[PDB]
Amino acid sequence: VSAAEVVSAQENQTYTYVRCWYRTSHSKDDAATDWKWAKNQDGSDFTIDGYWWSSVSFKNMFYTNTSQNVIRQRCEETLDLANENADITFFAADNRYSYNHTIWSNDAAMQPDQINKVVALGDSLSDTGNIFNASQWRFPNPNSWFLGHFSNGFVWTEYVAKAKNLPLYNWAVGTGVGEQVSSYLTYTKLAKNYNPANTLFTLEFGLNDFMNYNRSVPEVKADYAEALIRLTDAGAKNFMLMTLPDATKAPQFKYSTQEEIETIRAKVLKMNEFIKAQAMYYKAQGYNIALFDTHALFEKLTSAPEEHGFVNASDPCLDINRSSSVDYMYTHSLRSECAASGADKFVFWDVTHPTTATHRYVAEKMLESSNNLEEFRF
Ligand SMILES: [Mg+2]
């Protein structure tokens, strides 16, 4: 995008409204959500000033001078739910028909030298709503998956961002990581006072490539190395990396052959050694890298769930008893064991994805790692 098209979009100042989403139930066993327009204390509609921009139709981001904390506070005050599990999220919307557009809060010209946002790249372990908006709010079904998250609540990146009180800008899609990098590079050219050294990047991918597309280990390794080359060349300094959990331990592989399981598992182990090597490579160059061994953690969770506060690591919480992508389009009841224990005691929500309690557990172990993240300046 041209420097003239950047200033041209920035000068096209308007306003929009804020859609405040929330979990309707007080229990995380129920994924259903609803929304209200953010209001001011006087009862008038809350608006934010700024400019829109999109590289392609309906894929709009709204850029505002208003901070994420001010917007979050307006939603909290408007909703007044007395719901400890409200799990509020918010977006820019002109009216009830708008998609859920991400609000980018522009940084100040005089930012201190400290991490001030999280930018996530990856797949369904990280997506907070991209494929959901792209599918017109149909995939995954919003009665059985929490508002576009492939789980019953927040994913690990949201828990990390929450713990550090940082805004989270998500590029993960439940379109490839190379395209997500290109998209991140394009949208941030429209951001004001953007310094990539103040961004904490999260990156996880490879499971979809091995599980769904049967991609070779070298091509996935090459794409991963490419994503880090492109981000570091564009000024990225801070990363949270993770090894891949062995997805063959998820319930969906009850329905796969042993030969398929062994193939995928072998690819995962090879990729994980490469991820560890990549983390070392960037650490050696002076980058701030936090590597967490999610693979080792999932081996423990799936072999001894009781040692980690879980009762079941073998079945989905949802009553899904097959592996079919069609199931993401429909509403499902919880299976009896999960309705009895609560979803906070199951490792898996559906046949593939962790519950939000597992996502929180992973986030907390990641936050602990590298001496409470001693190389990052928050
Ligand atoms: Mg490649």
Residue numbers in the entry: 30 to 203, 215 to 418
From the article:
The apo ValDLT was crystallized in the P21 space group with two protein monomers in one asymmetric unit. However, unlike the occluded active site in VvPlpA, the active site in ValDLT is readily accessible from the solvent region. A polyethylene glycol (PEG) molecule derived from the crystallization buffer could be modeled in the substrate-binding pocket of each monomer. Nevertheless, the superposition also identified conformational heterogeneity in both terminal regions and some additional regions, such as loopβ3−β4 (81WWSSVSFKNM90) and loopβ8−α5 (202VGGAAGENQYIALT215), indicating flexibility in these structural segments. Notably, loopβ8−α5 is located at the opening of the substrate-binding pocket. It exhibits a defined conformation in monomer B; however, in monomer A, most of it (residues 204 to 214) is completely disordered, lacking defined electron density to trace. In comparison, ValDLT contains a canonical Ser−His−Asp catalytic triad composed of residues S153, H393 and D390, with the oxyanion hole contributed by the main-chain NH groups of S153 and G204 and the side-chain amide group of N248. In monomer A, the oxyanion hole is ambiguously defined, as G204 is located at the disordered region of loopβ8−α5. In monomer B, the same region is in an ordered conformation that brings G204 into a proper oxyanion-hole forming position, due to a Mg2+ cation that bridges E208 and D263. Furthermore, another oxyanion hole residue, N248 in monomer B, differs in the side-chain conformation from that of monomer A. Unlike those in VvPlpA and monomer A, the oxyanion hole in monomer B appears to be well-formed, with a water molecule occupying the putative oxyanion hole position, stabilized by the hydrogen bonds from all three oxyanion hole residues, S153, G204 and N248.
